[PDB]
Write a protein that binds this ligand. Structure first.
Ligand code: NA
Length: 300
C-alpha cells in the first residue's frame, strides 16, 4: 500500500464510492452514491438541451462509441474558446449521457464544450484505448484549428484524468503550437500509478485492462520520463483530489503533482474540502457551486 502507509484494505482504497460521507443512513452508501450519480447526471444531460437553450452537434472521431458531442449557444460567437471534458469510470463503465454535468455553466461563460466518449476495456487493452485517445487529441486539435480557434482547456475526471495525462507525452501529435493553445489542464481525482490496481481482481477482473509487466510503466503517468517540458510553460496544470476520497487517490494526486512540479511543469495540488469523488462532478452543473467557482477562477 504505497500512497496509504496506514491502509488495512487495499481494494476498498481503490473504490472511491466507499469514501463519501453522504447517504450514511443508507445500508450501502457506496451504492446509493453511484445510483444518485447516474440519476442526477443523466438529468443534467437532458436539462442542457431541453431546458437550458443549449445546442448540441453529434460528431465522431472513430467508429461506434468514439463520439464527441459539442455544446454551444447560438447566442455566442463560433470563435469561442473550447473546453474539453474526458469522463471517468475505471476504463470500463460510464458514457456520454452521464458526462455532461460540466457543460451548462461553461456555455454560460462563453465556451463551446466538447464532451467525448471512448471504447472501454476489454474491447481494447488500456494501451489500445490510449492509442485511440491519442486519435482523439489529434481530432480535437484538427477541429479547433479548422475553426480557427486557438484557446483550449482540457479536464478529465478519474480514469479520464489518467487518459488526459498523455497529452504531455505525444509530441508527434501535440506540436509546440498546439501546446501553446492550451490555457489549462485540469486533473480531477485521477489515478496515475497502476502497479497496485493492475494486480487486483475487483478493479482489474480477469485482467480486462490487459495489463502486464512490459506495459505497466506505459499506462502509468506517474512513472514516465517527461521531456520537453518547456513547451508547456504557457499552460497551467491543476491536479485535484476531493477531501472525501480514499487516502490512496488523494496521495496519488499529491504525488503526481509533485512529479510534474519536480519536472518543471506549472502544476499544483488541491485538496477540495467537502467533496467526494462523485459530487465534485455533480456540482459542476450548478453555476454557483464551489467547484464551478474553482473552474471559473482558473480563468484569472
Ligand atoms: Na481563442
Amino acid at each position: 500500500h504505497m500512497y496509504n502507509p496506514r491502509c488495512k484494505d487495499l481494494d476498498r482504497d481503490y473504490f472511491p464510492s466507499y469514501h463519501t460521507t453522504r447517504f450514511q443512513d443508507q445500508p450501502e452508501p457506496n451504492l446509493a452514491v453511484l445510483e444518485h450519480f447516474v440519476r442526477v447526471t443523466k438529468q443534467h444531460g437532458r436539462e442542457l438541451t431541453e431546458k437550458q437553450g443549449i445546442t448540441v452537434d453529434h460528431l465522431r472521431y472513430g467508429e461506434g462509441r468514439q463520439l464527441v458531442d459539442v455544446f454551444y449557444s447560438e447566442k455566442t460567437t463560433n470563435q469561442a474558446p473550447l473546453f474539453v471534458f474526458v469522463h471517468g469510470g475505471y476504463w470500463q463503465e460510464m458514457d456520454m449521457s452521464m458526462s455532461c454535468s460540466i457543460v451548462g455553466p461553461l456555455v454560460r461563460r462563453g465556451y463551446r464544450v466538447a464532451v467525448m466518449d471512448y471504447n472501454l476495456c476489454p474491447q481494447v487493452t488500456l494501451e489500445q484505448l490510449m492509442t485511440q485517445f491519442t486519435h482523439f487529441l489529434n481530432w480535437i486539435f484538427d477541429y479547433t484549428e479548422m475553426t480557427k480557434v486557438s484557446s483550449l482547456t482540457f479536464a478529465g475526471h478519474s480514469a479520464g484524468a489518467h487518459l488526459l495525462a498523455q497529452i504531455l507525452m505525444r509530441p508527434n501529435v501535440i506540436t509546440a503550437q498546439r501546446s501553446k493553445m492550451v490555457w489549462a489542464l485540469i486533473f480531477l481525482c485521477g489515478v496515475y500509478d497502476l502497479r497496485e490496481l493492475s494486480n487486483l481482481e475487483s478493479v482489474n477482473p480477469k485482467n480486462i485492462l490487459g495489463l502486464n509487466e512490459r506495459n505497466i510503466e506505459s499506462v502509468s503517468p506517474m512513472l514516465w520520463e517527461y521531456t520537453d517540458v518547456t513547451v508547456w510553460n504557457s499552460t497551467k496544470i491543476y491536479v485535484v483530489a476531493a477531501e472525501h476520497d480514499s487516502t490512496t487517490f488523494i496521495e496519488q494526486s499529491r504525488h503526481y503533482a509533485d512529479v510534474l512540479r519536480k519536472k518543471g511543469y506549472k502544476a499544483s495540488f488541491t485538496l477540495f474540502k467537502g467533496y467526494d469523488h462523485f459530487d465534485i462532478i455533480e456540482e459542476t452543473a450548478i453555476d454557483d457551486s464551489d467547484v464551478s467557482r474553482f473552474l471559473r477562477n482558473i480563468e484569472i
